[PDB]
Amino acid sequence: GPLEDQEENTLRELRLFLRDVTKRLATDKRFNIFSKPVDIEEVSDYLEVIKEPMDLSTVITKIDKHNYLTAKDFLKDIDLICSNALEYNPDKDPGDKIIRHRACTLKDTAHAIIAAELDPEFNKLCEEIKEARIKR
Numbered sequence: 195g196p197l198e199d200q201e202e203n204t205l206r207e208l209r210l211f212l213r214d215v216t217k218r219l220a221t222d223k224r225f226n227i228f229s230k231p232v233d234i235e236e237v238s239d240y241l242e243v244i245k246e247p248m249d250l251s252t253v254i255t256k257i258d259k260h261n262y263l264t265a266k267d268f269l270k271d272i273d274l275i276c277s278n279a280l281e282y283n284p285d286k287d288p289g290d291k292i293i294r295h296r297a298c299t300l301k302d303t304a305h306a307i308i309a310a311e312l313d314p315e316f317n318k319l320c321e322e323i324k325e326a327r328i329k330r
């Protein structure tokens with residue numbers, strides 16, 4: 195009915211918005227290491243250290259599978275990408291500092307894009323849609 199139709203429109207443009215944001219992050223060359231899942235040959239112990247891996251391609255997949263009801267849930271997976279890089283790469287060799295700084299840069303960039311371009315009242319409507327669906 196009308197309620198369900200208005201709900202789907204809201205989420206449709208949320209997905210269009212998040213899909214545009216995720217594309218702007220993957221094409222940024224600084225974040226290329228986060229745009230695809232890791233190759234285990236490069237990091238054979240990665241799945242023993244990182245219990246919940248995440249990347250930008252997987253984020254796109256979850257956008258299309260309708261897994262995100264809010265922009266905050268989208269940012270939780272961006273934050274997961276960053277905290278995983280901080281957990282797997284310790285503050286030691288010079289290469290470690292590079293990827294750790296790129297991870298925090300990726301996290302700050304994504305939060306700043308959402309904060310500048312997402313209407314707060316559109317966002318609150320998404321938050322209300324999610325809470326209604328979780329408890330119904």
Ligand SMILES: Cc1cncc(-c2cnc(N[C@@H]3CCNC[C@H]3OCC3CCS(=O)(=O)CC3)c3[nH]c(=O)c(C)cc23)c1
Pocket residue numbers: 227228231232233236237278279282283287289290292293
């Ligand atoms: C081309 C490629 C494909 N798949 C995985 C790697 C890789 C390889 N090594 C890692 N950690 C090591 C652990 C020991 N200290 C050096 C770190 O690599 C630093 C290097 C900096 C330049 S980079 O292009 O960002 C790849 C990481 C990684 N640490 C990671 O958190 C990730 C996501 C990847 C990674 C590279």
